[PDB]
């Protein structure tokens, strides 16, 4: 086509979605991780994660207001990944890299899994 | 902080939100324009438009599944802006610029209003 494009549009949209999350506006699901609860928007979770995409396209699960993750999932790893989903920023540290990578593999967040693999390989 | 950032994350999120819109997945509102109906996600509309942000933060309107726009709003202008919201691409043409600018002013989409003003000023 002959469209023009606003370079900062996608980033501004994600920034606003994160502001709605902060203020708990229009959040439609609670993710339960080892009795730690995280409120989010189903569409943002689907847009970032192969696991949430599969969950919320399921005819029965699409209607659930609570999703319980596997008990092996670490709440801090989930929190770091939820923050990444809404900001593009990943708080990756020596002390959390194993939990973050395991959570990203479970959530099916391939780009996060890739950078964790590379950061681990650099330290060996 | 000491975060790393995935450059293409925001763009990939918006691309996935547009794929959900195309497939009518988790759309939670219908926008009615001169008897033309557009399905969308309330959060994306809020993230892009000052008008939708005000509408869906209202305690009564946040719960509506149908929103009727002012009858002076042109459906093609709305369609072009809805596409921009989900893609960052604006299909701005000599034949639609007046309708697009009027719709962007009503929707309170300041960056769109700005480029329309500039494109109009270049033609005078």
């Amino acid at each position: 086509d002959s469209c023009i494009q606003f370079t900062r549009h996608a980033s501004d949209v994600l920034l606003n979605l994160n502001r709605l999350r902060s203020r708990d506006i229009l959040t439609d699901v609670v993710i339960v991780v080892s009795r730690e609860q995280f409120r989010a928007h189903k569409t943002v979770l689907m847009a970032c994660s192969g696991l949430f995409y599969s969950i919320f396209t399921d005819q029965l699960k699409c209607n659930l207001s609570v999703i319980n993750l596997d008990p092996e999932i670490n709440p801090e790893g989930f929190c770091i990944l939820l923050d990444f989903m809404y900001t593009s920023r990943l708080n990756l540290r020596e002390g959390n890299i194993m939990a973050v990578m395991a959570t990203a593999m479970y959530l099916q967040m391939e780009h996060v899994v890739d950078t964790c693999r590379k950061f681990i390989k650099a330290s060996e | 902080d000491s975060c790393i950032q995935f450059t293409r994350h925001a763009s990939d999120v918006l691309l996935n939100l547009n794929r959900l819109r195309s497939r009518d997945i988790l759309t939670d509102v219908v926008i009615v324009v001169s008897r033309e109906q557009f399905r969308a996600h309330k959060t994306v509309l809020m993230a892009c438009s000052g008008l939708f942000y005000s509408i869906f933060t209202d305690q009564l309107k946040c719960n509506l599944s149908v929103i009727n726009l002012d009858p002076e709003i042109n459906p093609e202008g709305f369609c072009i802006l809805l596409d921009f919201m989900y893609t960052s691409r604006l299909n701005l043409r000599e034949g639609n610029i007046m309708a697009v600018m009027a719709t962007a002013m009503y929707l309170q989409m300041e960056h769109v209003v700005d480029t329309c003003r500039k494109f109009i000023k270049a033609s005078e």
């Binding site: 023009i4 494009q5 | 604006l90």
Partner: peptide, 4 residues
């Protein structure tokens, strides 16, 4: 704004 840019030409994509």
């Amino acid at each position: 704004w840019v030409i994509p």
